Design a protein around this ligand. Structure first.
Ligand SMILES: C/C=C\C/C=C\C/C=C/C/C=C/CCCC(=O)O[C@H](COC(=O)CCCCCCCCCCCCC)COP(=O)(O)O[C@H]1[C@H](O)[C@@H](O)[C@H](OP(=O)(O)O)[C@@H](O)[C@H]1O
Ligand SMILES: CC(C)CCC[C@@H](C)[C@H]1CC[C@H]2[C@@H]3CC=C4C[C@@H](O)CC[C@]4(C)[C@H]3CC[C@]12C
Ligand SMILES: CC(C)CCC[C@@H](C)[C@H]1CC[C@H]2[C@@H]3CC=C4C[C@@H](O)CC[C@]4(C)[C@H]3CC[C@]12C
Ligand SMILES: CC(C)CCC[C@@H](C)[C@H]1CC[C@H]2[C@@H]3CC=C4C[C@@H](O)CC[C@]4(C)[C@H]3CC[C@]12C
Ligand SMILES: CN1C[C@@H]2c3cc(Cl)ccc3Oc3ccccc3[C@@H]2C1
Lengths: 286, 215, 57, 336
């Protein structure tokens, strides 16, 4: 029974630490893949690699052994690393969206004032926002009842912290991406729309195919993010406030938590393994 | 461990490397364009509006620095120096509409086909500038268009005749990710440089859209 | 048209009145050079690592 | 129209004389030679600093320093031993297709789509490399320039002519005419009393520097010739063309000797070069690779893979210690 769970979770963690690593490496080797865009995709892989080697393994222990057998000090470290490293991962997707928006809407900026220093600033802000969510519980905003049981490693259920931490990690990022990617869709459609009759109908057909591509791509990007992390964050806003008469089945809890932790295996695929440039570099290396 | 001389050698190397980088940053912010076409096509007029072998005219328009390379003075095989201009953002092509009667137009049509189909210029967009629109317009009245193109089955009116020559020019393009921007050159106004600007800004946006996967 | 044809004729005349040797002799001389200067070809005959200035000086 | 028929009779006379002087192919005579064997070369250095396609390079006479030119308008003088940059000259025109290194090491030259050859004085009173002389007079892109000595230079351009210049005065003392097409390459004899040129008309010629007349013409290729090089003995040369095949010609025999082609190769040759003893023939190709040939056998003895893009330049040191190859990816590499 626990053997089965161990094997399956072990596969998730293994595939993640492998996938993320390859993406980080390819950029460092091939000088083809060293532009401002690929730097932000690479820094997403680094953040997901840190999730896969620090957060995931200890969470798998807490799942198989169904108790915290590492001690109260290790418990606080896990909660703080979990919040910091997963707040960064969600906000890295907003950095990629913001960089993409500026390129489609301002062509002049793209040529001139788009710097590799822009990349650094965006990356630094993701980690800053991370610390600002994770530091509060560790010093303040913490009830003794939360750490009453040493057999459990649970986050602060303070109604105050619930709103602060749930909104400033998932809900605000969600709205930002929906708006930015919404405007990129508008801009795309505008450009797409704006013997010789054979050529004419080839043009009208290419337009229809490109319209389909701009729907599919946005579907994969926004879709993955929502179906992975949203199931988790609805529960993590309602349940704290509605204490009584809201028993989560133990099973459901585990499924939604690990569906979330599986975005660190799909983020490498959607952003790097799908684009042509990375694929080509991997063929050159191996 | 390094001797005095070896250390000074490394210092010289590092100063050079610093300059080499600074010069590369400030040379990736220029939009490089290739001016092509026949000799007396109206390349001259376009050069003048923008201001032995290759002549470079650089200008700034709306916070965007352009560089336009003219190779009309290079009388040699095109193959052997056409690979050097693989990185150009667009190609500006000048055609003399009124020169068909004097065929000169047939020569221009052939050069156009070649530069559309070169392995180095498969996707490089072309901005076509059909010159001498007024001079064409007055002379078709007398000397017809059927002389240059027997297939022409349409009437000899300015709008219809000019549009025929344009559709015929756009037919040589047989590749996607490559658009042709035709424009009848508007007097001595700043409209001509605006057509280059709008075309360049459109091909920057299209390239970014393709990178994201949305084009 | 006529002047350049005269030029061609005279040039071709010069390039016919030269003294050529049999390929056998010519070929043997090229082979001899390559087997009497063979000891001096670092690329052909790998050089000791101590004497290779582009690895270990 | 009778001069035509006279010239056609002379053509036949020459053809038959060459056939008479042929008796045994080089392949037969050098059958007895034991094979050289696999030659496995491994890159020793990698020089970085060009931010665009490298078009030319030239080793120094001391076998240490090398010049290189690229489309980014930079002429960098390296130090292959330690990969230190000794100079970085900014070109007034970024369109450069040739560069040269003076035998004494006091000068360098370059040219390109601008129909001018520029000479730079490396060692000057203020320690600052400036343009000393610019030589104009060619009507086409300069394709190769070789320093005959410290005071004279030979150039070939796309107007189908080569000229001999006087650097002090700047006026071409002699002009070599006769080529039917663009001149793409040029090589000086070890004595520097003769040189050969390859043109797009698929022919090669032998010129006399002092007299300015074409001694011989060689026509064996089926397309334009991109590179040419003298055999170290000075009595033969090798050519590379878009036909994907190299050939070896002998001056005294006045005809082709061998051919270096493979059915697996379909791309053209960008450059050719020999080794110190003349037993190897290194040729760059458009397949992003460089093949080492057995000059005495016509059998491949190696492959210098390692470049991302087309190999545009190639050279061998005077002492024969190492070979450097540039490419359109802006990376030099010393192999040894
Ligand atoms: C419809 C339902 C959707 C399903 C998911 C995607 C399906 C799909 O269409 O897959 C295509 C084929 O790829 C493979 O077969 C790739 C096969 C292997 C995948 C990567 C390696 C496997 C990962 C193992 C773990 C390590 C790939 O997608 P695509 O080429 O069809 O179209 C685009 C894609 O939608 C854009 O996201 C992408 O944008 P980017 O964010 O910049 O990368 C574009 O570049 C482009 O890849
Ligand atoms: C439970 C865990 C351990 C399973 C790990 C296997 C992962 C890597 C597998 C399972 C589902 C797979 C995806 C299924 C759907 C598609 C679309 C298709 O075009 C192939 C690529 C892609 C995007 C696959 C990539 C690899 C993938 C993500
Ligand atoms: C994250 C894992 C578990 C699931 C990944 C796929 C999910 C997110 C699903 C849910 C909604 C789906 C999209 C719904 C509709 C369309 C439009 C269609 O014309 C192309 C496919 C596309 C774009 C689908 C792609 C796959 C999709 C994005
Ligand atoms: C293609 C990839 C992204 C798919 C990822 C699937 C993930 C979310 C799956 C694969 C294995 C699954 C686990 C398998 C078994 C158990 C034990 C059970 O008592 C609680 C749920 C739990 C812990 C599951 C959670 C979800 C899980 C981790
Ligand atoms: C299982 N963990 C919980 C943790 C978390 C919980 C709350 Cl209520 C708010 C913020 C959080 O940080 C983030 C931030 C983004 C994504 C996941 C998490 C992780 C996932």
């Amino acid at each position: 029974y626990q053997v089965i769970t161990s094997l399956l979770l072990g596969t998730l963690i293994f595939c993640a630490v492998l996938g993320n690593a390859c993406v980080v490496a390819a950029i460092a080797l091939e000088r083809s893949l060293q532009n401002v865009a690929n730097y932000l995709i690479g820094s997403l892989a680094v953040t997901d690699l840190m999730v896969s080697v620090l957060v995931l393994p200890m969470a798998a222990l807490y799942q198989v052994l169904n108790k915290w057998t590492l001690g109260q000090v290790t418990c606080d470290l896990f909660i703080a690393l979990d919040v910091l490293c997963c707040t960064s991962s969600i906000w890295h997707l907003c950095a990629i969206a913001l960089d993409r928006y500026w390129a489609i809407t301002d062509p002049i900026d793209y040529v001139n004032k788009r710097t590799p220093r822009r990349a650094a600033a965006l990356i630094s802000l993701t980690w800053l926002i991370g610390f600002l969510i994770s530091i509060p519980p560790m010093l303040g905003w913490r009830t003794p009842e939360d750490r009453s049981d040493p057999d459990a490693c649970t986050i602060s259920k303070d109604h105050g912290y619930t709103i602060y931490s749930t909104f400033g990690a998932f809900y605000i990022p969600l709205l930002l991406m929906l708006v930015l990617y919404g405007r990129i869709f508008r801009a795309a459609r505008f450009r797409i729309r704006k013997k010789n009759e054979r050529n004419a109908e080839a043009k009208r057909k290419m337009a229809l195919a490109r319209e389909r591509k701009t729907v599919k791509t946005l579907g994969i990007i926004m879709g993955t993010f929502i179906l992975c992390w949203l199931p988790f964050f609805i529960v993590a806003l309602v349940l704290p406030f509605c204490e009584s008469s809201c028993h989560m089945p133990t099973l459901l809890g585990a499924i939604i938590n690990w569906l979330g932790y599986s975005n660190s295996l799909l983020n490498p695929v959607i952003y790097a393994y799908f684009n042509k440039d990375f694929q080509n570099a991997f063929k050159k290396i191996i | 461990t390094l001797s005095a001389e070896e250390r000074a050698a490394l210092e010289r190397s590092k100063a050079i490397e610093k300059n080499l980088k600074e010069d590369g940053i400030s040379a990736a912010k220029d939009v490089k364009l290739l001016l092509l076409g026949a000799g007396e096509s109206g390349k001259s007029t376009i050069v003048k509006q923008m201001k032995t072998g290759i002549v470079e005219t650089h200008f700034t328009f709306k916070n965007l620095h352009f560089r336009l390379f003219d190779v009309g003075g290079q009388r040699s095989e095109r193959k052997k120096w056409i690979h050097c201009f693989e990185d150009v953002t667009a190609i500006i092509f000048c055609v003399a509409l009124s020169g068909y009667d004097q065929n000169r137009m047939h020569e221009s049509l052939m050069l156009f086909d070649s530069i559309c189909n070169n392995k180095f210029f498969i996707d490089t967009s072309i901005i076509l500038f059909l010159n001498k629109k007024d001079l064409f317009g007055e002379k078709i009245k007398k000397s017809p268009l059927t002389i240059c193109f027997p297939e022409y089955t349409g009437p000899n009116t300015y709008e219809d005749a000019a549009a025929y020559i344009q559709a015929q020019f756009e037919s040589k393009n047989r590749s996607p990710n490559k658009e042709i921007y035709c424009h009848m050159t508007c007097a001595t106004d700043t409209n001509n440089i605006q057509v280059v600007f709008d075309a360049v800004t459109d091909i920057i946006i299209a390239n970014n859209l393709r990178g994201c996967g949305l084009y | 048209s006529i002047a350049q044809a005269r030029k061609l004729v005279e040039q071709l005349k010069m390039e016919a009145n030269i003294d050529r040797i049999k390929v056998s002799k010519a070929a043997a001389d090229l082979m001899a050079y390559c087997e009497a200067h063979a000891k001096e070809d670092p690329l052909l005959t790998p050089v000791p690592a101590s004497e290779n200035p582009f690895r270990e000086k | 129209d009778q001069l035509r028929q006279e010239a056609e009779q002379l053509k036949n006379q020459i053809r038959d004389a060459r056939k008479a002087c042929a008796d045994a192919t080089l392949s037969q005579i050098t059958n007895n030679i034991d094979p050289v064997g696999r030659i496995q070369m491994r890159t020793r250095r990698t020089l970085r600093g060009h931010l665009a396609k490298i078009y030319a390079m030239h080793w120094g006479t001391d076998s240490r320093l090398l010049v290189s030119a690229s489309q980014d308008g930079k002429l960098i003088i390296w130090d292959s031993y330690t990969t230190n940059k000794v100079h970085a000259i900014p070109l007034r025109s970024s369109w450069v297709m040739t560069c040269a290194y003076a035998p004494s090491g006091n000068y360098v030259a370059c040219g390109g789509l601008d129909n001018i050859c520029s000479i730079y004085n490396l060692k000057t009173r203020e320690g600052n490399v400036r343009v000393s002389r610019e030589l104009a007079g060619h009507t086409g892109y300069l394709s190769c320039c070789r320093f005959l000595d410290d005071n004279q230079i030979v150039t070939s351009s796309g107007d189908t002519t080569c000229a001999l210049w006087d650097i002090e005065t700047g006026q071409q003392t002699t002009t070599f005419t006769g080529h039917t097409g663009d001149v793409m390459s040029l090589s000086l004899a070890p004595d520097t009393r003769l040189f050969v040129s390859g043109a797009c008309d698929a022919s090669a010629k032998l010129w006399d520097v002092r007299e300015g007349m074409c001694r011989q013409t060689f026509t064996g290729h089926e397309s334009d010739i991109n590179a040419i090089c003298f055999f170290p003995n000075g009595n033969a040369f090798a050519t590379g063309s878009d036909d994907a095949t190299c050939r070896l010609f002998d001056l005294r025999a006045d005809q082709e000797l061998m051919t270096y082609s493979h059915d697996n190769i379909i791309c053209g040759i960008t450059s050719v070069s020999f080794s110190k003893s003349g037993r190897l023939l290194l040729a760059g190709y458009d397949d992003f690779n460089c093949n080492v040939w057995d000059a005495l056998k016509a059998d491949r003895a190696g492959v210098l893979a390692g470049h991302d893009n087309r190999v545009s330049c190639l050279g061998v040191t005077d002492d024969g210690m190492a070979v450097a190859t540039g490419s359109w990816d802006s990376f030099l590499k010393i192999w040894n």
